[PDB]
Amino acid sequence: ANCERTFIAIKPDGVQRGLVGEIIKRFEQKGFRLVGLKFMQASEDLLKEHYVDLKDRPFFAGLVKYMHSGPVVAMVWEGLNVVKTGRVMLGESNPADSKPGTIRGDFCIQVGRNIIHGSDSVESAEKEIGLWFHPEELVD
Amino acid sequence: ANCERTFIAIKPDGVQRGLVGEIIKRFEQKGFRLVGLKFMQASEDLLKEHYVDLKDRPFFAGLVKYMHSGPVVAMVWEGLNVVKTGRVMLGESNPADSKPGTIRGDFCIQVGRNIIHGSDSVESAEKEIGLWFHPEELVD
Amino acid sequence: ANCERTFIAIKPDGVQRGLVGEIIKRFEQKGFRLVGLKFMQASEDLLKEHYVDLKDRPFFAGLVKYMHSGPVVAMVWEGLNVVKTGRVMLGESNPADSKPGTIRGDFCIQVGRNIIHGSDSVESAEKEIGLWFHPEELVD
Amino acid sequence: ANCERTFIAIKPDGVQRGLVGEIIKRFEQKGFRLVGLKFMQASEDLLKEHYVDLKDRPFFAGLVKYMHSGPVVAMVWEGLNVVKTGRVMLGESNPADSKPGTIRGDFCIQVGRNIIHGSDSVESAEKEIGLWFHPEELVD
Amino acid sequence: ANCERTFIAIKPDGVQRGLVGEIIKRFEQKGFRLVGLKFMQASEDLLKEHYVDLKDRPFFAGLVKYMHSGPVVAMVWEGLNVVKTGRVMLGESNPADSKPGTIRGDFCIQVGRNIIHGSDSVESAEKEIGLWFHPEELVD
Amino acid sequence: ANCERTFIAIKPDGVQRGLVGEIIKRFEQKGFRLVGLKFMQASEDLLKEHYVDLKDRPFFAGLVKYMHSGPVVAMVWEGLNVVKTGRVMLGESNPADSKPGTIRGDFCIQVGRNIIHGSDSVESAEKEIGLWFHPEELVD
């Protein structure tokens, strides 16, 4: 009914600069609850199936090394229609078309090293959280 | 010329959670002045003519009891074309289509228990303030 | 047990500049609840018994006219030992000795036209709220 | 490649009220760097070629006197496609169509005394900075 | 030299209300880096050795059940003399003597259900992080 | 009477990280006005008489090169007893004794590369502004 769970991630640029506080705020003050917050670098074992559909791209190697550069923060949120709300409130991956008020539209400049990744659909969200978060990791 | 006066209200959810500070801020820092700020629960004598046009709705009783649950904050603002500016800066009552940067688009999740009510037109504003604020209550 | 109620007021400088949002915030985010929020100019009928103990001062007339200049906001808060917490979090009336982080220590410059008035003791608070807020005005 | 430089200015209303901090913030936290920040009133020698294309307007004299009223802040920013990003993040000069989240859409009320001026194109930016900032004034 | 690591925790009140964003901010904007951020409820296996020195207290059972009520956030920070800086910037556990500007002095009201726990000494910090964070959990 | 003018500067760390917005805010929202805001790197011609009294120190060369590393922002403020208010609101140069709520007590970690420099006395302020700001640079 209202137990839909999404996933939000922080790129190495976000942490090397340091913005996680407001990133958490934009969901916390909204009303969405968090069930899982894990910190890691994820190595390369998980940054192959996460972008498995993007493996046939020229930028796959460079971008995956860019993500692998440093540690990355992982969050899981739940709320009514949360998946759609997150993507629009995050903003388009291309800063050129990114209205003010969205996280990616307020801290991201270039398409290359973007800041935030989020699930487009419920199936993607559940698959990703299964890949990353063990069932005991989450809470209620 | 520039004496147009509007009305903004706070639902019981807004106060039971507590957000009135930023709600006031979004108008105060804008430049609009306030002429009236009264706090009450309004009983049921005023929550019948306020939604008199919505009396023929299945959700009228439940929603009016939800509003009657706790006390509600009432504000009056004035400014150039303030009525139109308030509604757009507040955001659509449906969070599904609510761009970031609007009060209802930054703290409201579900259509049922919305947060903010505002006058759609000048006539509605004047009728409501007559229903709620006595002429001596306001200031200049 | 925890029903102690205090009083906080806004000088005409605070509103003519406009700072009520953060003033409300500093108590709202703290956890204190509000039972009464009334807006008025208070005329001169209430600005004689409020400072009745200060009537024998050279600055009484000038300061009371300064307060009477414009409308003033009145608030009532409740919380555990709220009266003591409010005064320290407000800061000393003299900005010269006013540590950062207090409302009067972050927006007030000169002793003359100070910004915030608050009850020093429970008896003063109850007397003032009786003078200003009628029993039906407050809520629970 | 990424050395494109723009220009942002502060109207006398912005400083007489005082908002330069958040105005700087909206670009600083974004990632854009600043190469030049000069404070002056600019007299009337520069407020004739800045609006030379607007000289044939009925409001030219009144608006130029309004700008000449007080001192004005001048800033220069650089970033990828910064010129386009600044104008959209600033918001339309007409507050009537100004979505929330933009500087002009969050602090400006009337078209007459607007708050922020910015370069529409690279050529305008370079011409203006040549008119205002001497080459030694800027930094790298 | 500068690798000293501390520990900060969030009580169930902090999350059930929701304040983790600003709590993270107060350290992130300061300059301290984080090496570990894990979310759990910790059961009762870890809330016996954490307060082993407080086992001989009348409030031990009630307080440990209060902490066990909900999930709790765990953070680890590193910086020059970070342990001392954290405790003073957090504020005294007793709100009665808690100057404004400290996290516990800006969101905590009563001694009973306090908000933040932090290591008093380096030895306590290392013992606690050994109890909670596995060596592979942390990063560099 | 109230025309006392002080000086505040931004170290290269402050700009290379980027914090000038809040630094300006802490004075702007207070009420102090600014008469001069110039941006430069100042070369070494001015970073010899500024610290002429500190020339007989072992850290003079290293610290002066650290300041010379990048450009530095210069500001001038005026207000009632502004010089004393600035220094206390800035906080002690040593972060070890720096209460929360002060700029240096909220963003500085180590004594070596401090963030903010300010005039201790009126004579120092006037001498410094004479060294840096030409009389025509300032405004009224």
Numbering used by the authors:
A (entry chain C), B (entry chain A), C (entry chain D), D (entry chain B), E (entry chain F), F (entry chain E): 2 to 141
Please, what does the article write about this entry?
Nucleoside diphosphate kinase A (NME1) is a multifunctional enzyme that was found to be pyrophosphorylated on Thr94 in human cells. A major role of NME1 is the synthesis of nucleoside triphosphates, other than ATP. NME1 catalyses this process by transferring the γ-phosphoryl group from ATP to a nucleoside diphosphate (NDP) via an active-site phosphohistidine intermediate. Oligophosphorylation was critically dependent on the catalytic histidine residue His118, and cryogenic electron microscopy analysis of the modified proteins suggests an intramolecular phosphoryl transfer mechanism.
For this, purified pS94-NME1 and ppS94-NME1 were vitrified, and cryo-EM datasets were recorded and refined to final resolutions of 2.8 Å for pS94-NME1 and 3.3 Å for ppS94-NME1. Notably, additional cryo-EM density at Ser94 was observed in both cases, which corresponds to the monophosphate or pyrophosphate group. The model for ppS94-NME1 indicates a more pronounced effect, and the distance between the β-phosphoryl group and the N1 of His118 amounts to only 4.5 Å. Further efforts to visualize the link between both side chains by comparing the maps at the same threshold showed that the densities for the His118 side chain and the pyrophosphate group are forming a bridge in the ppS94-NME1 map. The structural data suggest that the β-phosphoryl group of ppS94 is optimally placed (within 4.5 Å from His118) for a nucleophilic attack, and in closer proximity to the 1-pHis118 intermediate than the pS94 residue. This observation is corroborated by the biochemical data, which showed that ppS94-NME1 was much more competent to undergo oligophosphorylation, compared with pS94-NME1. The assay for ppS94-NME1 revealed that the pyrophosphoprotein exhibited almost no NDP kinase activity, even at a protein concentration of 1 µM. Interestingly, when ppS94-NME1 was incubated with ATP, an addition of four or five phosphoryl groups (+360 and +400 Da) became apparent. This ‘hyperphosphorylation’ was dependent on the catalytic His118 residue because the kinase-inactive mutant ppS94-NME1(H118F) did not undergo this modification.
